Amino acid sequence: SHENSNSATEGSTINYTTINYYKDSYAATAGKQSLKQDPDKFANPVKDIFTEMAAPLK
Amino acid sequence: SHENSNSATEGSTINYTTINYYKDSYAATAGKQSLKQDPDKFANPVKDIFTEMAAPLK
Amino acid sequence: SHENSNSATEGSTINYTTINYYKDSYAATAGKQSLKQDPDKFANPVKDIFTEMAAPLK
Amino acid sequence: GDRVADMIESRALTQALPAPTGQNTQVSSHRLDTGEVPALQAAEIGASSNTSDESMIETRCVLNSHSTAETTLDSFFSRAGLVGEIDLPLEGTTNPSGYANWDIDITGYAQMRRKVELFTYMRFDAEFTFVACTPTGQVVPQLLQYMFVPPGAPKPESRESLAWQTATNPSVFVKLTDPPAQVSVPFMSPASAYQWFYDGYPTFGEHKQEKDLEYGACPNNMMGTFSVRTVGSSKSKYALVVRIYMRMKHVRAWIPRPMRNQNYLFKANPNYAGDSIKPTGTSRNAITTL
Amino acid sequence: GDRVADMIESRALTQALPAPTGQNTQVSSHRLDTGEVPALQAA
Amino acid sequence: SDRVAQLTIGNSTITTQEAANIIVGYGEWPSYCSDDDATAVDKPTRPDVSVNRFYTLDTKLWEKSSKGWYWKFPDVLTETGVFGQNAQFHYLYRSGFCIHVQCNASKFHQGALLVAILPEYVIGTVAGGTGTEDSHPPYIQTQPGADGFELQHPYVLDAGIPISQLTVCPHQWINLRTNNCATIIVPYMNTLPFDSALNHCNFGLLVVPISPLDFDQGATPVIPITITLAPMCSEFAGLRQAVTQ
Numbered sequence: 055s056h057e058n059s060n061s062a063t064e065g066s067t068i069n070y071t072t073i074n075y076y077k078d079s080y081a082a083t084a085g086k087q088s089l090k091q092d093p094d095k096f097a098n099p100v101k102d103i104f105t106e107m108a109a110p111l112k
Numbered sequence: 113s114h115e116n117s118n119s120a121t122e123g124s125t126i127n128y129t130t131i132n133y134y135k136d137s138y139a140a141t142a143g144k145q146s147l148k149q150d151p152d153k154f155a156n157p158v159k160d161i162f163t164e165m166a167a168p169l170k
Numbered sequence: 171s172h173e174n175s176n177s178a179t180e181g182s183t184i185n186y187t188t189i190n191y192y193k194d195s196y197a198a199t200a201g202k203q204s205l206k207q208d209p210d211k212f213a214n215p216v217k218d219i220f221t222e223m224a225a226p227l228k
Numbered sequence: 229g230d231r232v233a234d235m236i237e238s239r240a241l242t243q244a245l246p247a248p249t250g251q252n253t254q255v256s257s258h259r260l261d262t263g264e265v266p267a268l269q270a271a272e273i274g275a276s277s278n279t280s281d282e283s284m285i286e287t288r289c290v291l292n293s294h295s296t297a298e299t300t301l302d303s304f305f306s307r308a309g310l311v312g313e314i315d316l317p318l319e320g321t322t323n324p325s326g327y328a329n330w331d332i333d334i335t336g337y338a339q340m341r342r343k344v345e346l347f348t349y350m351r352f353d354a355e356f357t358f359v360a361c362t363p364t365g366q367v368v369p370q371l372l373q374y375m376f377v378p379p380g381a382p383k384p385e386s387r388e389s390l391a392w393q394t395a396t397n398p399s400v401f402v403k404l405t406d407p408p409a410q411v412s413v414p415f416m417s418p419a420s421a422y423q424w425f426y427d428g429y430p431t432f433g434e435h436k437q438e439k440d441l442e443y444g445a446c447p448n449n450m451m452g453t454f455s456v457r458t459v460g461s462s463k464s465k466y467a468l469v470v471r472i473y474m475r476m477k478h479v480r481a482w483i484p485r486p487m488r489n490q491n492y493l494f495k496a497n498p499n500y501a502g503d504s505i506k507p508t509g510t511s512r513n514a515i516t517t518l
Numbered sequence: 519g520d521r522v523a524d525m526i527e528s529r530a531l532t533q534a535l536p537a538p539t540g541q542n543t544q545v546s547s548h549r550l551d552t553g554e555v556p557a558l559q560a561a
Numbered sequence: 562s563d564r565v566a567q568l569t570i571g572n573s574t575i576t577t578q579e580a581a582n583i584i585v586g587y588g589e590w591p592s593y594c595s596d597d598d599a600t601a602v603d604k605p606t607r608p609d610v611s612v613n614r615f616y617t618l619d620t621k622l623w624e625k626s627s628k629g630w631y632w633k634f635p636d637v638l639t640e641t642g643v644f645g646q647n648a649q650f651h652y653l654y655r656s657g658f659c660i661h662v663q664c665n666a667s668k669f670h671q672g673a674l675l676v677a678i679l680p681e682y683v684i685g686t687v688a689g690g691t692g693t694e695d696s697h698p699p700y701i702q703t704q705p706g707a708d709g710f711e712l713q714h715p716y717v718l719d720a721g722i723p724i725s726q727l728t729v730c731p732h733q734w735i736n737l738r739t740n741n742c743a744t745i746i747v748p749y750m751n752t753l754p755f756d757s758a759l760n761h762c763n764f765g766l767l768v769v770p771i772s773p774l775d776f777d778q779g780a781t782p783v784i785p786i787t788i789t790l791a792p793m794c795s796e797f798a799g800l801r802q803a804v805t806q
């Protein structure tokens with residue numbers, strides 16, 4: 055595994071399980087990626103995050 | 113061996129000897145499965161299991 | 171090497187050098203077998219084995 | 229927060245033992261013994277009889293090394309059987325314009341259907357294989373596109389349609405000079421098992437005679453539509469057939485049931501011929517002869 | 519010189535007790551007891 | 562110790578003193594849905610007494626020329642009692658059943674029955690007789706209810722499957738020289754853990770006389786067959802207004 059870092063997914067800490075045969079990383083498999091999701095930057099991107107139980111407009 | 117658990121035979125303790133080349137477990141070999149059989153749930157599924165030697169209706 | 175013992179040559183102590191790719195042993199190579207021969211069960215299968223040097227009918 | 233004793237007080241019988249070979253027969257001798265009788269069973273219990281060889285006849289020590297691996301479900305079902313045939317003729321009535329929508333129902337041919345109707349619920353992966361050729365048998369340099377249309381996707385309505393762009397559907401482009409296209413298919417049903425038998429109706433409401441067509445039709449089994457066209461704007465100059473073979477792997481089957489003895493007549497219903505109910509076996513003239 | 523288990527596995531009920539005299543008759547009493555019956559035999 | 566039994570659940574008990582034995586269908590008791598299996602996210606109702614009762618349903622007379630009957634469960638109990646009220650309000654449903662069928666006769670009558678279960682007992686037709694017209698069975702042959710329905714061709718069980726190998730499925734015999742009743746405890750068998758109680762009928766209770774009834778004239782000619790059933794470990798979910806069908 056002495057390939058170049060050519061893939062368009064470089065920019066995370068963990069690597070992926072992509073098998074590759076050429077010396078270029080963009081020719082690799084798509085593989086399986088990390089199942090991390092962050093819905094709070096699209097669902098509730100408010101400044102001061104209010105909880106569920108309280109009334110939102112105190 | 114960094115595949116997903118996609119096969120329709122997940123649900124036992126032991127795995128099988130199935131060789132796989134893709135990242136999905138349902139694309140694997142059928143392999144050889146465990147030779148465990150339980151005939152007593154179809155042959156004699158009685159509540160209080162009577163033995164061979166005794167008369168069945170005491 | 172997690173194959174079934176399906177080959178028609180099971181019945182000896184030593185195995186053979188047969189490469190196999192499927193899970194069934196009868197699909198394997200013929201390989202090379204043991205160079206043991208026993209000519210004395212076809213040549214001289216007599217009850218009381220007489221030697222070379224003596225006359226056979228004392 | 230209670231003072232009652234009713235609420236505070238408010239599991240399988242069989243163990244699967246490993247059995248690689250059939251069981252041995254230990255040595256028995258004669259027995260002249262009252263009280264215990266291994267022959268006289270009670271069949272009205274509804275149990276199969278647990279009488280063995282040794283307690284009926286004097287037997288010898290037989291080390292049974294006969295393997296029970298051929299009779300597992302993964303060795304009984306993992307054989308590719310013919311489950312579908314798709315015709316793409318040059319001129320005719322049935323698909324004259326070089327496309328065919330075959331909805332995936334593998335109960336259309338009576339050798340694969342007969343085996344998998346032994347069990348009620350089956351959960352399996354499958355690998356389909358699409359052996360395609362001219363009706364005379366020969367292979368012709370013709371390109372085909374197979375695509376799998378799930379329930380809800382747009383069915384392609386013509387050869388030169390827009391649904392053949394396969395932006396998200398899986399599709400296979402194979403020509404007939406190639407070996408048969410073989411792809412593996414997971415367990416896709418919403419339920420935990422493909423049930424071959426659904427005694428019930430899918431929809432609510434009153435059930436009149438006009439909508440008895442839904443009886444026995446479970447939506448957990450109908451998994452879409454398999455579509456195939458000859459790749460091109462013009463019409464292809466070859467008549468085609470596409471035979472579909474599937475073998476099942478990673479099989480789990482539940483709840484056995486009696487195997488069909490009358491001829492199959494339709495798909496997705498057990499309708500049988502009424503005047504032609506034939507006996508399940510052969511027959512003889514008298515019982516006291518052979 | 520065998521490997522079979524059939525061949526390798528291949529008597530009076532009464533004891534003569536000494537009785538010089540006829541047996542004695544021990545003391546019995548009445549009995550009002552179900553379950554056990556000494557009279558009803560099976561000939 | 563096997564001929565005599567007593568089955569008490571709910572507020573209703575049944576005694577039998579010439580039973581055969583209780584068989585538990587597929588070797589396991591009916592149980593509640595674990596949280597590994599459940600997908601509905603509302604808390605189920607579990608009445609636990611008011612619906613776990615032996616409901617005595619109907620009485621079929623068995624004469625010398627009968628064919629056989631079948632009852633689709635649980636549609637025998639969606640018109641009866643607090644089970645029939647909870648199954649009409651609630652969309653989802655699961656339960657097991659303790660199925661007890663009585664048929665007494667004298668010690669001079671003879672004959673045997675095969676009371677058997679089978680899951681997903683779908684009903685075919687005679688296909689227009691010659692076998693060319695796709696006729697579907699009506700709603701009353703499909704789901705007869707507590708009235709039951711009589712088999713037309715019991716050799717093929719109206720489904721193209723022979724009765725000679727019905728004995729695979731959970732069953733026991735009522736032959737009138739030995740026993741007079743047949744208890745069959747059936748768990749909940751279905752793929753998905755709850756289902757609708759009005760559409761899907763999980764199994765059918767085939768009761769077929771194989772060896773026919775026979776008695777010399779002078780004995781009692783009326784030999785009834787009554788089936789009593791008890792939903793065990795029943796629970797419902799998805800409350801809405803009453804549907805009847």
Ligand SMILES: *[C@@H]1O[C@H](CO)[C@@H](O[C@@H]2O[C@H](CO)[C@@H](O[C@@H]3O[C@H](CO[C@H]4O[C@H](CO[C@H]5O[C@H](CO)[C@@H](O)[C@H](O)[C@@H]5O[C@H]5O[C@H](CO)[C@@H](O)[C@H](O)[C@@H]5O)[C@@H](O)[C@H](O[C@H]5O[C@H](CO)[C@@H](O)[C@H](O)[C@@H]5O[C@H]5O[C@H](CO)[C@@H](O)[C@H](O)[C@@H]5O)[C@@H]4O)[C@@H](O)[C@H](O[C@H]4O[C@H](CO)[C@@H](O)[C@H](O)[C@@H]4O[C@H]4O[C@H](CO)[C@@H](O)[C@H](O)[C@@H]4O[C@H]4O[C@H](CO)[C@@H](O)[C@H](O)[C@@H]4O)[C@@H]3O)[C@H](O)[C@H]2NC(C)=O)[C@H](O)[C@H]1NC(C)=O
Nearest residue numbers: 621622623624625626627628629711712713778781782783
């Ligand atoms: C118009 O015109 C028209 C024309 O005619 C008409 O019509 C009509 O109508 C009428 C009225 O309805 C009618 O009559 C009636 O009839 C009926 C019927 O009959 C029929 O049927 C039968 C049946 O059978 C069955 O069963 C048996 C047993 O039982 C068996 O064996 C068999 O097999 C069968 O089975 C089946 O079925 C079932 C059902 O349930 C099922 O389940 C199963 O599975 C199976 O499938 C029959 O049998 C019959 O037969 C007959 O015929 C033949 C010929 O071929 C012969 O062979 C025979 O033998 C017979 O005969 C006999 O019988 C009859 C009776 O049955 C007599 O009659 C004569 O004579 C001789 O003897 C048939 O087919 C019936 O039922 C009825 O009867 C009744 O009534 C009378 C008067 O009315 C009297 O007399 C009698 O006795 C009776 O009574 C009884 O019943 C009731 C009701 O049910 C009751 O309630 C009472 O109580 C009584 O009982 C008693 O007695 C008995 C004795 O008998 C005893 O057993 C008991 O226990 C008790 O004690 C009547 O008759 C007619 O039919 C018609 N027609 C024709 C032609 O058909 C009209 O009407 C006009 N219009 C005006 C306006 O008029």
Ligand SMILES: CCO/N=C/c1ccc(OCC[C@@H](C)CCN2CCN(c3ccnc(N)c3)C2=O)cc1
Nearest residue numbers: 333334335354356376398399400413422424449496
């Ligand atoms: C390029 C893309 O290539 N794609 C290939 C491809 C192949 C197969 C495929 O899906 C296969 C589905 C089968 C595995 C199971 C069929 N089943 C389930 C039970 N069932 C029943 C149940 C009760 N009554 C009736 N009548 C039928 C039935 O017929 C999808 C895609």
